[PDB]
């Protein structure tokens, strides 16, 4: 069902003798050339929509004092991370899809795999931290606390460490980076058992530390937040403002949580399925589906966490409309 090599796994059978190294020749047996072109189209769209939105976010923060508050530090970190995803991953995949394999070879595979995975984990953990921070200021879990600059900076550092924790180890033998799907982009090898790199234990660690923990924290933090807000409103029903604030805070949480799930449940979904069923067969186009969801977050996370933020949105509109409005 598959062909193996020293640094790769092509999901196609070499019984016809047709398979080549994804580092050396096109994979047009894996998929038609047009399907490669459509990949490149999707890459192009992600860069064309992703870069402006994420860049613009940084650009207005330079332009507007009000944006440069601690509680936004993490949303900035999000945008940077998203940009690592576009220039680390998307631009490269665009280049390679048009060749039909991974031209840059193994060393490139690791570069591309590291930075693309770094970005994604940073963004992910930023989402978690933001919820932790929100939880702390709104729910006031600890007396005599005021969230400041030096806390915000910890939050950021924490993201970068947790992302390093995921992206770094494959570079040094615990798991590995190899082309996935149509072999134009490189990712963590979570589908083949590579005893030499202990893939299995890493896939466990990843699943536990970098999916169920985030998921629990997000659900707990926002769960409490919604509870606190609902409670306050219930006791202050004379205030229509507070009732509005409650409804809107609830709506955003549902969106954020549903969005988070759309982003990571497919990746976690198939990884679990491949882990549990080791005997299985998996197409190239099937393997790209979890990726498709996770990567598109570079566009939609900013939309949710930034463009739907009244403050950022205003500054963006004035900056975009040459000042005023």
């Amino acid at each position: 069902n598959g062909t193996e090599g020293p640094n790769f796994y092509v999901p196609f059978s070499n019984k016809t003798g047709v398979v080549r190294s994804p580092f050396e020749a096109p994979q047009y047996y894996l998929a038609e050339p047009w399907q490669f072109s459509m990949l490149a189209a999707y890459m192009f769209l992600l860069i064309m929509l992703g870069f402006p939105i994420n860049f613009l976010t940084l650009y207005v923060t330079v332009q507007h004092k009000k944006l440069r508050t601690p509680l936004n530090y993490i949303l900035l970190n999000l945008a940077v991370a998203d940009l690592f995803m576009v220039f680390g991953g998307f631009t490269t995949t665009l280049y390679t899809s048009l060749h039909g394999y991974f031209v840059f070879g193994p060393t490139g595979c690791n570069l591309e795999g590291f930075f693309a995975t770094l970005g994604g984990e940073i963004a992910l953990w930023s989402l978690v931290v933001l919820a932790i921070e929100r939880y702390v200021v709104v729910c006031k879990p600890m007396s005599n606390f005021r969230f400041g600059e030096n806390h915000a900076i910890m939050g950021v550092a924490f993201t970068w460490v947790m992302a390093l924790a995921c992206a770094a180890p494959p570079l040094v033998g615990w798991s590995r980076y190899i082309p996935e799907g149509m072999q134009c982009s490189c990712g963590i090898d979570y589908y083949t058992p590579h005893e030499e790199t202990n893939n299995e234990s890493f896939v466990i660690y990843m699943f536990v530390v970098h999916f169920i923990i985030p998921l629990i924290v997000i659900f707990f933090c926002y769960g409490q937040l919604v509870f606190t807000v609902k409670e306050a409103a219930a006791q202050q029903q004379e205030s229509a403002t507070t009732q509005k604030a409650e409804k809107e805070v609830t709506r955003m949480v549902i969106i954020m949580v549903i969005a988070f799930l759309i982003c990571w449940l497919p990746y976690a979904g198939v990884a679990f399925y491949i882990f549990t069923h080791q005997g299985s067969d998996f197409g190239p186009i099937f393997m790209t589906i979890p990726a498709f969801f996770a990567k598109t977050s570079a566009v939609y996370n900013p939309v949710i966490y930034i463009m739907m933020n009244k403050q950022f949105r205003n500054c963006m509109v004035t900056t975009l409309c040459c000042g005023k409005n």
Partner: peptide
Amino acid sequence: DIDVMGL
């Protein structure tokens, strides 16, 4: 300040 969370 609490409402500055995003809204």
